[PDB]
Structures are given as structure tokens and as C-alpha cells.
Amino acid sequence: IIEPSLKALASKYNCDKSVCRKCYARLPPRATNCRKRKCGHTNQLRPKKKLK
Amino acid sequence: MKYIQTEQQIEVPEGVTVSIKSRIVKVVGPRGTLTKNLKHIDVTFTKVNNQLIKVAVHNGGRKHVAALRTVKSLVDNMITGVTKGYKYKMRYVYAHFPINVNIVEKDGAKFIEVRNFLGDKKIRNVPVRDGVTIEFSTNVKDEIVLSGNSVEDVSQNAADLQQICRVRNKDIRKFLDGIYVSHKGFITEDL
Amino acid sequence: GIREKKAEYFAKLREYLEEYKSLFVVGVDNVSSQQMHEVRKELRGRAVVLMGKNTMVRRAIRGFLSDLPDFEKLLPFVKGNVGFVFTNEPLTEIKNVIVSNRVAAGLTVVQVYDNGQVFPS
Amino acid sequence: VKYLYLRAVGGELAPKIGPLGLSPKKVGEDIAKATKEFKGIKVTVQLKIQNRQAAASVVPSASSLVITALKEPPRDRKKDKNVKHSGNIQLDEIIEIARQMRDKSFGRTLASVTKEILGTAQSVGCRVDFKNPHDIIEGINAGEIEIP
Amino acid sequence: AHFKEYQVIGRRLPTESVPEPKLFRMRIFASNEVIAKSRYWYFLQKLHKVKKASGEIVSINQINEAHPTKVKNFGVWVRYDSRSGTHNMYKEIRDVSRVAAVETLYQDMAARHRARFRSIHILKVAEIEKTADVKRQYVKQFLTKDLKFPLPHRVQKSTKTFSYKRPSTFY
Amino acid sequence: TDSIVKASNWRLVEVGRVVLIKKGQSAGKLAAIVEIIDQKKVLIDGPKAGVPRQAINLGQVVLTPLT
RNA sequence: UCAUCUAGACAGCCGGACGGUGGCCAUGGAAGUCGGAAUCCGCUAAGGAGUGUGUAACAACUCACCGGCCGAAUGAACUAG
Ligand SMILES: [Zn+2]
């Protein structure tokens, strides 16, 4: 156990992201398009897979 | 679509003085002074009444009028950073191995050293950019405060200290150990 | 459509100003719809309560400015969340009812306009 | 001191609520059935007031229940659990009586409005021999006085 | 080329069963009379059952601009063929005359949609008599009160291949 | 002290601005800008120097400091 | 091509987001939110017989709607260079 607030603060940077389906890039959670050129700024995004 | 005139404003408080020759900005306030080269962005400045300065671009494209609001935000950040200052509070996060952070001096350069992050024998040293003061805060457990005038220098030093504690070859959703910035604000917040 | 609904609002307001000499400006903060509904029921017989967008109201008063010129004085007071109470009863009885009803952890009467005269009250 | 409200089909969980009040489930059921007697056949809101010794049961007026009762209904066992769709006559007087029975309880806006709301409550009931319920309510001003 | 506007009036050839046909008239932007009459017969073959062998042209007249020194705003309705289909567009141009407005229209369509003269159909062009009926921002920008703007970065082209001082782009 | 900027004004184009025709049939006379067509061209008139009232591209004239 | 718009639009904060009614069937329960149908009134400035989270069912939170600040264009779907 870390602490509940400290787990929230660490998960803000480590777990509450989104993943581009084409190029696996770690993206902002409210993003609409990937920031990478190689996937062509696609809008195929998924949430980052949580535990539990 | 070639917007022929777009224009932003910056408010100058009573304590500061701003000097703009060609595109070099100098802001002088109570906490000190800051400077900025802006010869890459191609705008024009105009003082109105010694507490208002308009910045304008004529016949600009979409990217150019985006850069206008960007440079307004940069010079306004400089003004509020020399008036109120900038303070970033970061917290230490560990599961088992406590992170031991001190300040050392190789050749008088004010290094921040990080020991025992996930129990390793490696010592992580991050340098300190000039103008940034670091205090290990009392009365809150495991909290470090970086203060200064330049938001760029303070936030970059905080980001370097955050990025130096990354976990390799482990599931980072479970191994949440590190040093993360929890608060961003001013030194004289709620002035 | 939107303009039609709006036009009706302008008309009703004009009628209300003419109908009742006494006007109460009431500021509502954190007052629930249920709290408001109860107040309306208590005062249904002697008072009319009107709620509207301020931008909409100011234009209406300016539009109706030539008639009822004294109502112009009310315009500075209109700023901020406001409600209009039009009542036959002259003053205190209405005021007492509004403040007392539904105080929970709160209606307040910011200003009173009666007969071309404004009272801070 | 404590009031508990439940919707109960008449003639009859209750125990879970009763345990907090330390009241026998059977006793409560008998009292409720006693009240719902009027129309155990239909669900109805029962108010139980607890005196810390015993609970008193009353049936609170509900628009749907009053409307359903007004539509004449052959008693239904409910073992069948049929759709039991409700078809009703205009019953204009009964609805006006229902509006009066509500007596603007819970602040219905107007006596006529209370009736209009009562008409809307008959989503379930046909509420007219030949018309949609409350379709003609706007059209006809008749019975406004009766509701008051 | 540099366009001119003509009225072209024509009709069918008169027969004994029907003398005096109905004398249709059209306004054509074209470089000259030959192209104007060709475009006239093109649009009449698109509209009515007639062709050049079966009809005749009774008049062609150049219509020059009534006030060539008044600055107008024109709304232009256009059909064009793209590479996949046919589309309608409405573009509005602030300019001093109709022929110059359609010249800048042809340049604008060729620049922004790669549409050629053979693909563009001019449905109509009309002066917008009132402001606030202007619907495009790029022309509504120039209708503001006391419009003034600078011209930064003056480049002066030189006649000599060598210049003896560093040039200035002040204007 | 007081805030100091370098103003950097130059030769706005508006109505009443006097221009010098650089090249063309006039080629060296003065005109006055009557109205602004768009970003690149204006309607000018030079009635004392004999310049006819015309629309002209802004690259064919030079703006003078006179207004 | 649809919509909104100085009678205040879209973002961002803040407040309300209610009664008839736990609408009718059906379930051991399902009260806006397991489903089947209907989907109507009142008070309104405004609030769906409900957009989600949500509980055994509740309760609770949030919505789309209306309001104060902001004062001027913006949202959705589609087409092609
Ligand atoms: Zn990607």
C-alpha cells in the first residue's frame, strides 16, 4: 500500500493515459488524435488497460 | 485565410518595467529581472499607456496568429513570474524503499542527489538550473519545493527530477515509485 | 421560434410593470427549484414572481422606456442574479414572507422599487 | 416519531424495515391489510407512523391508485400475472373528485391544473370513453369550478 | 484570357409551321465573340432542343460595366466538376467590375480546386447591394470602419546584379 | 522608471494616403488612395497629375509619407 | 446541408436541475437509469415519465435544460484541392 492520495497522484502520470491502437503511443487521456506522424495522427485510441 | 489584423494585450502592473527593443524583452520587477529573445516569431509590440502593451500581427496565417497568442502568454508568464514568483511542490512516492534526497556539491554546482530509489546502489544526480531555489519542506512528509522566477527553469528542473526516477523492466502501473509534481503555483499565491 | 418565445416574454413583462405599482427585486443564490416553487405558491394570491435572462430584460426596459420612464431607475439594480416580484401589497408584508420562507443550509431582497421610488430596505 | 412509507398491494421486505423499528412483521401486515382493505387489489402508498411501541397504518392518496380504483375493475387474483391492461370510462366527475381529493396536496399549481395533472397520471388508464386521456382538457373549461 | 461580358440573343430558324421563335438571351463571359457564341450554343444545347445548325444568332453585344470605378461586392454561384462528381459553390468577391470579378473567380477555382474553364459553369453573378448580407469572413474583413493596415517587409527588385549596401525592408 | 518599446511605425495604407505610381503608363505621378479593394490592390485617383481613377495592384505604387 | 447568434451563441468556472409519480405491465427486488410498451401535465427562467455513474431496491453524484461572469461567432455531419 502506498497511500490512497499518493496512489492517485502516481496513477495520474502512470495509468490515466490513452494508447494509440496503431503505434502504441502513450497519449493524454482526453486526446482525440495521436501526436505521432508514423500513424498519420489517427483517431483510433483506447484507454490504457488498468489492473483489478 | 490571411487575417489582416489580429491583436492581443498584456497588462503591466505598477511594480514592473518592460523594455522592448527589436524583439528582445526585458521585464524588471520586485523579485528581479528576466529576459527573452523572440526574434523567431515575427510580431510587433506597441506600448499604449505605460500599463498596457498591445502585440499585433498583420496579414497572418493560422499558425502565425496561433504564435501571437503564444507570445502573449509567454510575456505575461514572465511578468507574473517576476511579480509573484513560481513554486512547484513535488511529493516522494515509495512502497518499501524510502527515497533519500539530499543536496551535494561536485565543483560547487548544487547537485540534487537521489539515493535508494527502489533500493538500487546507483545514485541519481540531477543538476540545478540557476535561479531555482530548492527547499525540503517541513511539516508535510516527503515534499520538495522548487521556487524561482522563470517558469521554464523551475518546471524544467522539476521535470528533470521527475524523469530521473523512472522504473525499467517492471509493470509501472504496479511499481508506482517515483517523485511526482503535485502542486504548481506562486510563491505569493492569493496575494 | 426562439424569437417568438422571446417576444412573449417581452410582452408579459410590460404588462406586469403596468399591473403592479410595487416591484421587489429579489436575488436568488443557491435556491432550489423546490424552494422557489414553495415561495411561489405562498405568494400566488398577492404577488407575481418573474425570472429571466438579464440581457433579455435590459433590452425590454429600454424598449419600454418611453412609457413608464421611472422604471429606468431599476436598471442599475438589475445587474447580477435577480428576480422580479410584482405585488399589490405595498411593502413589508411581502418582504417578510419572502425572506422567511425556505431558509436552509435563502432568498434575499436586494432592492425595492415602489411608485418611481427606490428603497434599499 | 418515525414515519415509514411503502407501496403495498393490499391484502398481504416488510420484515427488514420492521426489524429496525422492532415491530412484528405479522402485526404490521395485518394493520396494512386493514388499511388497504379499501382496495387491496391495487398497489397503494401506505404510511406507517411509529410511536416507539406500535405502528399506525394509513393509506396516503396517490393519483395512480385513485385513478385505477375509479376505473371499475373486476377483482384480479394476480396469480395469472396477466397484463391486466386497464380500460376506463370518461369518469370526468371522478377525476375532478380525485383532484379535489388531492386538494392541491404538495402544491398542485391550480385547481384546474391539479385535475390536468390527475388526467396525465392516467397514462395507464384510458380515462375516456372515446378520447385520449386529457386530450380535451385544454379544449373544455368545464369542471374547473368542480375541482376547486 | 481577360474576360468581356456579352449578351447573345438567338432563336430557332423560322419555319412555316412556326414563324417568330421565342428569342432566347444569355449573358456570357468570354474572351471574344467566337468563344461567346460557342458558349451560348453550348448552354442552349444543355437547355432546349436546338443546335447551331437548326438555329441562328440574332444579336451579340458587349455589355461593359455601368460604374467601372465603384467598388462592389459580388456573390457568384458556380457549378464545377471535380474528379469524382459535380458540386455547387457560392463564392463572393470584392472587386470593381463584373469581368474582373469573374477573372479572379476563374483563377480562384483553378488555384483552390484545380478546376478548369471547361469544368466551371457560371450559374449567376450579382452585386450584393447591402452590407451584412455578406456571408464570407475574407470579404467581411475589408468592410470595417476606418480600415487601415501596414505592408511589412518591402522587397525592392534591383536592376543591377551587384548592390553596394545592405538593403532595408522598412516600408 | 517607465516602460519603453520601439514603436516601429511604417506607412499605413488607408483612404487619403498619397502614393507615387512606380511603373505603368503614369509612372512617376502622384495619386490618392480612394478605397481599398483587398489586401493586394486599391482604387486610386490622381486627378491633378492626370492619373485616371482606377484599381491598381499595390506592387505598382509606392506609398509616400503624405496623408 | 442543417442548426444556434449582441433579445448574449460555443469553451471555462458557479448555482438550480423540481412536483403529480414509487406514471402502466413485469420481478424476490427494480422508485429516470434489468426489460416491454406509452411518454402526459403542473410550476416555470428551466428541468427527460431520463445522459451516465450508481444501490438488493433505495439513497447519492452527474448530465441536457435554464440562469450570473465572458461579449461574438460557434457546433455537428459531409465533399474535394
Ligand atoms: Zn499513433
GROMACS .gro file of C-alpha atoms (C1' of nucleotides) in nm, chain G residues 1-49:
model
   49
  751U      C1'    1  -2.660   2.077  -4.573
  752C      C1'    2  -2.852   2.151  -4.103
  753A      C1'    3  -2.870   2.423  -3.662
  754U      C1'    4  -2.764   2.829  -3.252
  755C      C1'    5  -2.643   3.415  -3.269
  756U      C1'    6  -2.542   4.143  -2.916
  757A      C1'    7  -3.321   3.971  -2.701
  758G      C1'    8  -2.585   3.725  -2.524
  759A      C1'    9  -2.424   3.186  -2.907
  760C      C1'   10  -1.982   2.765  -2.836
  761A      C1'   11  -1.529   2.669  -2.419
  762G      C1'   12  -1.432   2.769  -1.895
  763C      C1'   13  -1.583   2.844  -1.377
  764C      C1'   14  -2.053   2.891  -1.003
  765G      C1'   15  -2.596   2.791  -0.879
  766G      C1'   16  -3.064   2.537  -0.958
  767A      C1'   17  -3.168   2.090  -1.248
  768C      C1'   18  -3.835   2.035  -0.920
  769G      C1'   19  -4.354   1.807  -0.812
  770G      C1'   20  -4.813   1.475  -0.991
  771U      C1'   21  -4.528   0.999  -0.970
  772G      C1'   22  -4.254   0.459  -0.622
  773G      C1'   23  -4.654   0.704  -1.413
  774C      C1'   24  -4.870   0.145  -1.651
  775C      C1'   25  -4.709  -0.408  -1.717
  776A      C1'   26  -4.349  -0.744  -1.533
  777U      C1'   27  -3.996  -0.910  -1.099
  778G      C1'   28  -3.754  -1.171  -0.485
  779G      C1'   29  -3.636  -0.679  -0.592
  780A      C1'   30  -3.608  -0.279  -0.966
  781A      C1'   31  -3.863   0.415  -0.736
  782G      C1'   32  -3.544   0.804  -1.458
  783U      C1'   33  -3.141   0.455  -1.540
  784C      C1'   34  -3.263  -0.524  -1.595
  785G      C1'   35  -3.659  -0.502  -1.973
  786G      C1'   36  -4.185  -0.439  -2.254
  787A      C1'   37  -4.489  -0.058  -2.410
  788A      C1'   38  -4.657   0.452  -2.374
  789U      C1'   39  -4.402   0.903  -2.288
  790C      C1'   40  -4.855   1.347  -2.034
  791C      C1'   41  -4.932   1.761  -1.726
  792G      C1'   42  -4.818   2.136  -1.340
  793C      C1'   43  -4.453   2.509  -1.166
  794U      C1'   44  -4.172   2.750  -1.464
  795A      C1'   45  -3.623   3.122  -1.644
  796A      C1'   46  -3.565   2.579  -1.660
  797G      C1'   47  -3.551   2.063  -1.573
  798G      C1'   48  -3.604   1.374  -1.979
  799A      C1'   49  -4.213   0.952  -1.726
   0.00000   0.00000   0.00000
